[PDB]
Amino acid sequence: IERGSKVRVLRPESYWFQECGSVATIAKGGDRYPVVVRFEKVNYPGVAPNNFALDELGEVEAP
Amino acid sequence: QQWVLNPLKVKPIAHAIWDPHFGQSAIKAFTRGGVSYPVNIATSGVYHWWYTVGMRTNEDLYFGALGLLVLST
Amino acid sequence: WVTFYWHWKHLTVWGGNAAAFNESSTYIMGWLRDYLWLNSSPLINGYNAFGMNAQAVWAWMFLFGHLIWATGFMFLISWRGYWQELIETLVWAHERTPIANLVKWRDKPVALSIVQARLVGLAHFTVGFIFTFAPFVIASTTGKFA
Amino acid sequence: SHSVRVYDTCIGCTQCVRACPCDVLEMVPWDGCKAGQIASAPRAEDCIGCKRCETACPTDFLSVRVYLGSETTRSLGLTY
Amino acid sequence: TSDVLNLQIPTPTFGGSTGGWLRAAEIEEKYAITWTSKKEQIFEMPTSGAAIMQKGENLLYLAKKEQCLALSTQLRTLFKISDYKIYRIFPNSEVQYLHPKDGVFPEKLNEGRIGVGNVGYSIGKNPNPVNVKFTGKNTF
Amino acid sequence: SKVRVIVDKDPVATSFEKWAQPGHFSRTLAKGPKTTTWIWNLHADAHDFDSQTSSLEDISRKIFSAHFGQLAIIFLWVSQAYFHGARFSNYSAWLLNPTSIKPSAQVVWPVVGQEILNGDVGGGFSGVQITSGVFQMWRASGITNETELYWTAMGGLMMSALMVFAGWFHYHKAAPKLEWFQNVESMMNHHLAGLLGLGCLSWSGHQIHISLPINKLLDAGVAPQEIPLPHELLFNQDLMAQLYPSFKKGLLPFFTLNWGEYSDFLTFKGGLNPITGSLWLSDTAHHHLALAVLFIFAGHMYRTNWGIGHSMKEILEAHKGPLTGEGHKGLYEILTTSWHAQLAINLAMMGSLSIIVAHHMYAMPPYPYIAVDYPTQLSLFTHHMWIGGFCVCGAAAHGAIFMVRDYSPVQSYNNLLDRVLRHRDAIISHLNWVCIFLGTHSFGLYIHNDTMRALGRPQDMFSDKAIQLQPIFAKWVQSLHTLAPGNTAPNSLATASYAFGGDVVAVNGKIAMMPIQLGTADFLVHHIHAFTIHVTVLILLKGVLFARSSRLIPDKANLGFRFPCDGPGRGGTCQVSAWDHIFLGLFWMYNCISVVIFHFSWKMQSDVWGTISEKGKITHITGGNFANSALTINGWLRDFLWSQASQVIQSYGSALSAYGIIFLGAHFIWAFSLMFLFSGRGYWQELIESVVWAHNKLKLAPAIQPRALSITQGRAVGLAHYLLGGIGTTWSFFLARIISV
Amino acid sequence: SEFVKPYNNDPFVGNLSTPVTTSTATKLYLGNLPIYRKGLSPLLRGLEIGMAHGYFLIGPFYILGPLRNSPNALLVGLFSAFGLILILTLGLTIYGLASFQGTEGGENLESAKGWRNFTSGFSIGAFGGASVAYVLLDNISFF
Ligand code: CLA
Ligand code: CLA
Ligand code: CLA
Ligand code: CLA
Ligand code: CLA
Ligand SMILES: CC1=C(/C=C/C(C)=C/C=C/C(C)=C/C=C/C=C(C)/C=C/C=C(C)/C=C/C2=C(C)CCCC2(C)C)C(C)(C)CCC1
Ligand SMILES: CC1=C(C/C=C(\C)CCC[C@H](C)CCC[C@H](C)CCCC(C)C)C(=O)c2ccccc2C1=O
Ligand SMILES: CC1=C(C/C=C(\C)CCC[C@H](C)CCC[C@H](C)CCCC(C)C)C(=O)c2ccccc2C1=O
Ligand code: SF4
Ligand code: SF4
Residue (of F637, F604, F647) closest to F741 by Cα position = F647
Q: Are F487 and F264 in contact (CB under 8 A)?
A: no
Strand, coil or helix: F156: helix
Residue (of A1, A5, A2, A34) closest to A20 by Cα position = A5
Residue (of F603, F610, F606, F601) closest to F511 by Cα position = F610
The Cα-based distances of C100 to C95, C104, G19, G93 in angstroms read 8, 9, 20, 17
Query: E105 CB contacts (<8 Å, ≥6 apart)?
Result: E82
Query: G86 CB contacts (<8 Å, ≥6 apart)?
Result: none
Strand, coil or helix: C112: coil
Q: Report, in angstroms and rounded to the nearest whole number, the Rg of chain D calculated over CA atoms.
A: 13
- Triad F642, F648, F650: Cα angle to 5°: 95
Strand, coil or helix: F126: strand
Could you write out the three-class secondary structure of chain A? CCCCCEEEECCCCCCCECCEEEEEEECCCCCCCCEEEECCCCCCCCCCEEEECHHHECCCECC
Regarding beta strands E30-37 and E85-89, do their DSSP bridges make them parallel or antiparallel, or are they unpaired? antiparallel
Query: F193 CB contacts (<8 Å, ≥6 apart)?
Result: F295, F296, F298, F299, F300
Could you write out the three-class secondary structure of D22-77? CCCCEEEECCCCCCCEEEECCCHHHCCCCCHHHHHCCCCCCCEEEECCCCCCCCCC
Regarding beta strands D3-7 and E118-119, do their DSSP bridges make them parallel or antiparallel, or are they unpaired? parallel
| Residues F322, F102: Cα–Cα separation, whole Å | 62
Q: Are F378 and F351 in contact (CB under 8 A)?
A: no
What letters, b where the CB count within 10 A reaches 16 and e where it falls short, cover C104-115?
A: eeeeeebbbebe
| Residues E84, E67: Cα–Cα separation, whole Å | 13
What's the distance, CA F230 to chain centroid?
33
D56 Cβ below 6 A of ligand 10: no
N- to C-terminal Cα separation, chain D? 18
Regarding beta strands A49-52 and G16-17, do their DSSP bridges make them parallel or antiparallel, or are they unpaired? unpaired
- Enumerate the β-bridge partners of residue E31: E62, E88
Residue F182 dihedral angles phi and psi, to the nearest 5°: -80, 5
Output the ligand 7 site: residues, CB below 6 A: C 74-75, 78-80, 83, 87, 111-112, 117
Residue F275 dihedral angles phi and psi, to the nearest 5°: -70, -45
What's the distance, CA F716 to chain centroid?
22
Residue E96 dihedral angles phi and psi, to the nearest 5°: -130, 130
Q: Would an 8 Å CB–CB cutoff place B65 in contact with chain F?
A: no
Q: Is F624 left (phi over 0), alpha (psi -120 to 50) or beta?
A: left
| Residues F124, F94: Cα–Cα separation, whole Å | 11
Given CA atoms D70, D74, D75, D80 in this order, what sign does their dihedral have?
A: positive
| Residues F651, F738: Cα–Cα separation, whole Å | 12
**DSSP H helices in E28-117:** 65-77
D44 Cβ below 6 A of ligand 10: no
- Triad E12, E14, E16: Cα angle to 5°: 140
| Residues F156, F82: Cα–Cα separation, whole Å | 9
Numbered residues of chain C with Cβ closer than 8 Å to any chain E Cβ: 91-92, 95, 108
Residue F433's H or E segment, with its range, is helix F424-454
| Residues F454, B29: Cα–Cα separation, whole Å | 11
| Residues G139, G143: Cα–Cα separation, whole Å | 8
- Enumerate the β-bridge partners of residue F507: F510
Contact criterion met (CB < 8 Å) for G14 and C96? yes
Q: Are D21 and E86 in contact (CB under 8 A)?
A: no
Method: cryo-EM
Given CA atoms E121, E124, E130, E135 in this order, what sign does their dihedral have?
A: positive
Q: Are F372 and F280 in contact (CB under 8 A)?
A: no
| Residues B19, B38: Cα–Cα separation, whole Å | 9
Amino acid letter for position A62? A
| Residues F181, F47: Cα–Cα separation, whole Å | 19
Q: Are F81 and F132 in contact (CB under 8 A)?
A: yes
User: F232: exposed, middle or buried (C-beta count within 10 Å: 0-12, 13-18, 19+)?
Assistant: exposed
Listed as own residue / partner, the contacts of A26-31 with beta carbons closer than 8 Å and 24 or more positions apart are A26/A1, A26/A2, A27/D34, A29/D34, A30/D31, A30/D32, A31/D32, A31/D33, A31/D34
User: F389: exposed, middle or buried (C-beta count within 10 Å: 0-12, 13-18, 19+)?
Assistant: buried
Residue (of D58, E41, C78, G133) closest to F538 by Cα position = C78
Residue D67 dihedral angles phi and psi, to the nearest 5°: -105, 120
| Residues F181, F190: Cα–Cα separation, whole Å | 13
Per DSSP, the residues of F598-656 read HHHHHHHHHHT-EEE-GGG-EEESS-S-HHHHTTSHHHHIIIIIIHHSHHHHS-TTSTT
Strand, coil or helix: G60: helix
F721 Cβ below 6 A of ligand 8: no
N- to C-terminal Cα separation, chain C? 21
User: Which residues does chain D have within 8 Å of residue E106's beta carbon, measured at their own beta carbons?
Assistant: 17, 20, 23, 25-27
Q: Are B31 and B37 in contact (CB under 8 A)?
A: yes
Q: Would an 8 Å CB–CB cutoff place F409 in contact with chain E?
A: yes
| Residues F163, F147: Cα–Cα separation, whole Å | 24
Amino acid letter for position C13? V
| Residues F317, F328: Cα–Cα separation, whole Å | 6
| Residues F225, F307: Cα–Cα separation, whole Å | 56
**Do D and B count as touching (3 or more CB pairs closer than 8 A)?**
no
Q: What is the DSSP letter of D13?
A: -
Amino acid letter for position D1? S
Interface test with F, best of G2, G7, G68, G70 (most F CBs within 10 A): G2
- Enumerate the β-bridge partners of residue A35: A26, A52
Interface of D with C in 36-75 (CB under 8 A): 73
The Cα-based distances of G94 to F656, G97, G122, G126 in angstroms read 65, 5, 14, 18
| Residues C11, F605: Cα–Cα separation, whole Å | 35
Q: Are F284 and F264 in contact (CB under 8 A)?
A: no
Query: F641 CB contacts (<8 Å, ≥6 apart)?
Result: none
Residue G96 dihedral angles phi and psi, to the nearest 5°: -65, -35
Annotated binding site of F for phylloquinone: 684
| Residues F292, F198: Cα–Cα separation, whole Å | 6
| Residues C30, C36: Cα–Cα separation, whole Å | 9
**DSSP H helices in F118-183:** 134-139, 146-172, 178-181
Output the ligand 5 site: residues, CB below 6 A: B 21; F 440-441, 444-445, 447-448, 451, 460; G 60-61, 64-66
Q: Would an 8 Å CB–CB cutoff place C92 in contact with chain F?
A: yes
Query: G19 CB contacts (<8 Å, ≥6 apart)?
Result: F323, G3, G4
Residue E89 dihedral angles phi and psi, to the nearest 5°: -100, 125
In this structure, the number of other CB atoms found within 10 A of the CB of residue G116 comes to 19
Residue E80 dihedral angles phi and psi, to the nearest 5°: -85, 105
- Which residue from D37, D64, D66 has its CB within 8 A of the most atoms of ligand 9, so it is best to mutate? D64
C-alpha torsion D54→D55→D59→D63, nearest 10: 0
**Do C and G count as touching (3 or more CB pairs closer than 8 A)?**
yes
| Residues F134, F136: Cα–Cα separation, whole Å | 6
Residue with CA nearest ligand 4 atom 10: C74
Q: Are A50 and D59 in contact (CB under 8 A)?
A: yes
N- to C-terminal Cα separation, chain G? 50
Q: Is G81 left (phi over 0), alpha (psi -120 to 50) or beta?
A: alpha
Nearest atom in ligand 1 to F451's CA: 17
- Enumerate the β-bridge partners of residue G6: G16
The Cα-based distances of F713 to F94, F358, F674, F689 in angstroms read 48, 33, 14, 19
Please tell me the total number of residues recorded for chain F in this structure: 741
Amino acid letter for position F677? L
Amino acid letter for position F730? T
What letters, b where the CB count within 10 A reaches 16 and e where it falls short, cover E11-35?
A: bbebbbbbbbbbebbeeebbbbbbb
| Residues D63, D65: Cα–Cα separation, whole Å | 6
Residue E95 dihedral angles phi and psi, to the nearest 5°: -110, 145
